[PDB]
Ligand binder design. Structure first.
Ligand SMILES: *[C@@H]1O[C@H](CO)[C@@H](O)[C@H](O)[C@H]1NC(C)=O
Ligand SMILES: *[C@@H]1O[C@H](CO)[C@@H](O)[C@H](O)[C@H]1NC(C)=O
Lengths: 438, 438
C-alpha cells in the first residue's frame, strides 16, 4: 500500500504515522531523515597562487646595437637600454667608450610551493539535494537514499520510494566561489582572462601544471643605475597574499542553518531547512489482519503530570481492558503532541505509561491505543531550565499557546451589544407606531 | 583614444566608423566580426548504449534443496525452480525421481560495440560567447579574440579591447541534451538512477568502463519447460535502439540562425543574432595631425546611377579641388548607406568614383571626403533579381522606404480643416455680436 506524508527537513527528528486499511490493524510507520546531502554542479574555471618573478641573465651587446623581442611567457616584459655601465668582480665586462648597450627582460611563473598552495576558482549552479531515510514498519527497519527530486525513486529491497520536491529552495553557495587548503570562500572572482594587479586571481591558469599561462601585474623595467650589471625590477605586491590577509571569515562561520560543508565534493551536509513531501509504498504482506490483532475494551487515559518542556518530558498513562494477549501500536493523531514508543504489550486488564512531548501548554488531544481512540486532556507548566540544544519543537507552534482559561476570559470579555442595539431599534419602532396613533 | 560603437552580430559584415579629434584628420576604423563562438558550461551525467543480457550456466542441485541469492550486478535477477527436467546430449544430467531442482539467474552488461556506440547525456548551463574581431586603422590591421563579457579586455599588442554584453541572450542549447556519434540531440533525458524499461537511457553508468552499474529493464525468468537444460528469459526491447529508431531530426536542422555546432567542445560557432556594444582604444601615435593631411576644396557629389539592390550595387562620384597630394579617407555618416573603400588618393582637381550600398530607395544623405562634408541625393530602383544569399541589409530598414513623392502626396492629402473651423467660429461669434446689436 502507498501512503503520503510531509516531513520537516531536520536530522534526528523521527516522525510517526499510521495507515488505515479496512480489516487491517493500523501499522505504525517511523520515518527518520538520517542526514542531508546538498550537492551542486560546478565547473573548474582557473587556479591562482603566489607567483615568482623571473630574473634571467641580461643580454649585453658591446659597442653595437640590438633590438627588443617579445616572448610567449605570461606577463612578459622587455626593454633595451643604451649607454650601459657594465662592471663585475671580474671588471668591465666589455670595452667601448660608453657605446655598449644591454637588453633586459623578465616574466613570472608559479612557485613550487604553489603545487600545494593552489586556490581554485569555481562556478556553481543547480544545487541538488540527497536525503537518506530510514523507515521502521512492523518492527522491521529498511533504508533508502534518494535524490530530493520526486521522479527518481531509489532502490532498497527493490522498493520504490520517492521524496520531494522541496517546499522551498535553499543553497548557501553563490554563483562564484573559491577553494583553498580545504576552506571555501564566497567571492566574485574575476573572470578568466581578466588581469587586475593587486587583486585576487592576478595569476590565472587552466591547470596547475599548464605550460600556457596568462597574467598581467604591471612590471616596469628600471634603467641600469650602478657600477655593476644589475636589473632593477619594480612590481606590485602579489594579489594572492593580499586576498589572504583580508579574505574575511570562512563560509563555515556564515552558512545559514549550520550547513556542514565538505570540500572534496564541494557539497553541504547535515543542514536542515524546509519541508519534504514523500510517498512510501509498503508490501501488503507486511500488514496484519485485525482478526489476529489483540482486542481491547474500555480504555481510558490519565495525565499523571505534564511539563511544557522543550525536550521530551511529558508523561501519560492508560488503563485498558482486553481479552487477547499480544502487542498493539499506540499513536496520537494530534500533531501538537508526539509519542516516544509506537507499540507495547497488551494484557486482559493491564495499564501502561507513556512518554511524549508537546508544543503547547494546553495538553488536550486524542490518542489511540491499538485500534481504539480516546480523548485525554491536561495542562502543562513551563520548565525551570530554558536553554537546551536537544531536539525541540518536533511540531511547530500553531498559535495554540492560548489557554482554555484565556478563551473563557476572552469569551466573557466580548459583549453582545448587537443584540442590545437590535432590541433598542425594535422598541423604538414600536414606540414610534404607538405615538403615530396619537 | 577610446571610441564606442555598436555592431550587429553577424559574420562578413564590415562596419566603418570615424573618430573626431581637433587637429587630427578623421581616422577610418573598420571592424569585422570574423566568427562567433558560443561555448556553454556542461557536466557529464551518464552514458547509455545497447546492452547484452547475461545467460550464465545455471546451478543444479540434484535430489536436494537450494536457495536463491542476489548479486551486485546491475539489473540482476534470480529464481529457483523445483521439479526440474534436466536432459542433455549426454543425457539426464543427474538422477532422482523428479526431486532435483535448479537455480537460474541473469544480469546485463554493455556490449563491446558500446565502446564506440556510447551516447552521453549532458546537463548544460551558462552559455558563454566568444567573439573574434579584426580592426583596421590607418591601413594597419590588428586582431583580438575576447569573451563577450564587458569586463575582460583581451590581449593583442598589449592592447585592451572590450565588447558586449549582448543586447539579448540567445542559446539553441537546452538544459538537457545528448551526444551520440558526433550528433547532438535536444531531449529531456531521465535523471541518473531512474530506470524505465522501454525508454531512452535505460542503462546508465558514471563512466564507460565503470564496474559499478545500475539498471532495470524488467527481466522475468521462465520455468524450465523442455527436455534439455535451458533458461528461457523474457525482457523488453532495448531502449537505445528504440530512441535511435524515432530519435527525431538532429539539432543541426533545427538551430535558429543557422548555428554551426561542433561536438568536441559541445559549442556553437558562426551563428549570428543580436547587437554588441564595444569600446576600442587606439594609440595617439596612430593619429595624424591635420597639418600634414591633404587639403581639399570645393568638392561636389553626383549619383551617376543607383539601384535599390540587396547586394552592393550602388555607385557614386565626387569631384574635388585640392592643393596637396596624398591620401584622404571617405565616409558616410548616414547609417542607411555604407561605402566600400575608406580612403583614396587626392589630386589638385581630380574626380573619383565610389561603390556603396543602401537599405532605402531614397538615396539622400551626407558623405565626407577627407575632412569635408557634402550632401548628395538620388533615387534608386528595385532590381530584376530578387533572391540572393550574399550580405544584405548592412543597415536594417528604418521605415525610410517611404519616398519623397509619397511625402509630397501625403502632405497634399491632409487638409487644414482646423483653420476652417477656427475661422468659422470666429465669424460666428462676430455675427452673433452683430445681431445682439439688433
Ligand atoms: C513485531 O510485532 C509483532 C506484533 O506482535 C510480533 O508478532 C512480531 O514478533 C514482532 N517482530 C519482531 C522481530 O519482534
Ligand atoms: C597609410 O596611409 C597613409 C596616408 O597617406 C600613408 O602615408 C601610409 O603610407 C599608408 N600605409 C601603408 C602601409 O600603406
Amino acid at each position: 500500500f502507498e501512503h503520503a506524508t510531509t516531513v520537516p527537513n531536520v536530522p534526528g527528528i523521527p516522525y510517526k504515522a499510521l495507515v488505515e486499511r479496512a480489516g487491517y490493524a493500523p501499522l505504525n510507520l517511523e520515518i527518520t531523515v538520517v542526514s542531508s546531502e546538498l550537492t551542486p554542479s560546478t565547473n573548474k574555471e582557473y587556479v591562482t597562487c603566489k607567483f615568482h618573478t623571473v630574473v634571467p641573465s641580461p643580454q649585453v651587446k658591446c659597442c653595437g646595437s640590438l633590438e627588443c623581442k617579445a616572448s610567449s611567457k605570461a606577463d612578459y616584459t622587455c626593454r633595451v637600454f643604451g649607454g650601459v655601465y657594465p662592471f663585475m668582480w671580474g671588471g668591465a665586462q666589455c670595452f667601448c667608450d660608453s657605446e655598449n648597450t644591454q637588453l633586459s627582460e623578465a616574466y613570472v611563473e608559479f612557485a613550487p610551493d604553489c603545487t600545494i598552495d593552489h586556490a581554485v576558482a569555481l562556478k556553481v549552479h543547480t544545487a541538488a539535494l540527497k536525503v537518506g531515510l530510514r523507515i521502521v514498519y512492523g518492527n522491521t527497519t529498511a533504508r533508502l537514499d534518494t535524490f530530493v527530486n520526486g521522479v527518481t525513486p531509489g532502490s532498497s529491497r527493490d522498493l520504490k520510494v520517492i521524496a520531494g520536491p522541496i517546499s522551498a529552495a535553499f543553497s548557501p553557495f553563490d554563483h562564484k566561489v573559491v577553494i583553498r587548503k580545504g576552506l571555501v570562500y564566497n567571492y566574485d572572482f574575476p573572470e578568466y582572462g581578466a588581469m587586475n594587479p593587486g587583486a585576487f586571481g592576478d595569476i590565472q591558469a587552466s591547470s596547475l601544471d599548464a605550460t600556457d599561462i596568462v597574467a598581467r601585474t604591471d612590471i616596469r623595467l628600471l634603467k641600469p643605475s650602478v657600477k655593476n650589471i644589475h636589473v632593477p625590477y619594480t612590481q606590485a605586491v602579489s594579489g594572492y597574499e593580499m586576498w589572504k590577509n583580508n579574505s574575511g571569515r570562512p563560509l563555515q562561520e556564515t552558512a545559514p542553518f549550520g550547513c556542514k560543508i565538505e570540500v572534496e565534493p564541494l557539497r553541504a551536509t547535515n543542514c536542515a531547512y524546509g519541508h519534504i513531501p514523500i510517498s512510501i509504498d509498503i508490501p501488503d504482506a507486511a500488514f496484519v489482519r485485525s482478526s489476529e490483532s489483540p482486542t481491547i475494551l474500555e480504555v481510558s487515559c490519565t495525565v499523571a503530570d505534564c511539563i511544557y518542556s522543550a525536550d521530551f518530558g511529558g508523561s501519560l498513562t492508560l488503563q485498558y481492558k482486553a481479552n487477547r494477549e499480544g502487542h498493539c501500536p499506540v499513536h496520537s493523531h494530534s500533531t501538537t503532541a508526539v509519542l516516544k514508543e509506537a507499540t507495547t504489550h497488551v494484557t486482559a486488564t493491564g495499564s501502561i505509561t507513556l512518554h511524549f512531548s508537546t508544543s503547547s501548554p494546553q495538553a488536550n488531544f486524542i490518542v489511540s491505543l491499538c485500534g481504539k481512540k480516546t480523548t485525554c486532556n491536561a495542562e502543562c507548566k513551563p520548565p525551570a531550565d530554558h536553554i537546551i540544544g536537544e531536539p525541540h519543537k518536533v511540531d511547530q507552534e500553531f498559535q495554540a499557546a492560548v489557554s482554555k482559561t484565556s478563551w473563557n476570559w476572552l469569551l466573557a470579555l466580548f459583549g453582545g451589544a448587537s443584540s442590545l442595539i437590535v432590541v433598542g431599534l425594535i422598541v423604538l419602532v414600536c414606540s414610534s407606531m404607538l405615538i403615530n396613533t396619537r
